[PDB]
Every structure is written in C-alpha cells, then in structure tokens.
Design a protein around this nucleic acid. Structure first.
Length: 62
DNA sequence: CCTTCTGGGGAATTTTAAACCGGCGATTTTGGGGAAAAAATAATCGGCCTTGACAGCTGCACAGTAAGAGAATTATGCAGTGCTGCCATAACCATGAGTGATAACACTGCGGCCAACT
C-alpha cells in the first residue's frame, strides 16, 4: 500500500519524524485547504523542529 | 506359150522391255533435356532353428633355459692433507653520469569523530 511504503522510505531517510508529521499534516490538510506547497512547508517545519531538538539533545550529551 | 502369183533375203525402221542412275519424299536415328519408373544395393527388422553350458575348482609336475635377487669381493673415484708458486682482487684517487632527493600543487587513502539503528 501507500502508507507502509511511505514509512519505509521515511525511515530509510532517517525520518520517523517524517512518518509522524506526514500523518498529522495530511490529516490537517484533508480537514482544511492547504496548497501542496504549504503542506510541504509544514512537513519540513515539523521535520526540522524535531531534528533541531534531537541535535540540541545530542550536543548536550556531548 | 505367156502372164501373174508367191516366197526368200538383205536392209531399214519402230517399239517395248529391262536395267541403271539420279532425284525426291519419308522415316529413322542420334543427341540433349526432363520426368518417371524400375531395379539394385544396403541396412534394418522380426523370428525361427539349433546347440552349448550349467552342472565344486584349478593347481600343480616336469622339462630346459634364462633372469634375477642377495651376498661377498674387487676396482676405482672421491676426498683429505701438506708445501710451494702464481694470479686475481682490492685499495686509493680522479672525473663523469645517473638516480635519489627536494619543492609545490592535486588527488586520494586512512584514521578520528559523529550519528543512526537494533
């Protein structure tokens, strides 16, 4: 199906965040009118928020 | 007594039969090509007719000559040792040439560090 392959690719790119955020943003856009560009913008926003949180945690760990 | 008729023979001419040679029309024969059929030769198939073997197994004996295996004996080639002489090599200095090295930039290999998944 589509969801399983999406999650596969997301994890292969090291983006379980992508699997999680795509669910939320997809639900929101299906419940709203989000142009594909804005949907992608929200996707990248969530990805980089989680990525920056992880990077800060790793730096503090070091 | 005389006249007319007839017959034989030699020469000239005509016709028909026979034989040869040539010309003309027909069949035959030779050559080549294509197709069909027959026969010859080789290979493959089935089957009948006839008989050998299976019945403990073959190792040994003698004949003569030659080969070979083992042991003893002998010959010879290698090695070992001493003394003397000759040839090679090695040691030094000089000069030339080749290669290992050094500087600089570019590309690649290896080790340290960071992150992602189980």
């Amino acid at each position: 199906n589509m969801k399983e392959r999406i999650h596969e690719y997301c994890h292969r790119l090291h983006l379980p965040v992508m699997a999680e955020r795509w669910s939320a943003m997809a639900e929101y856009a299906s419940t709203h009118n989000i142009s594909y560009s804005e949907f992608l913008f929200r996707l990248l926003e969530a990805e980089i928020v989680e990525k920056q949180a992880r990077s800060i945690q790793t730096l503090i760990k070091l």
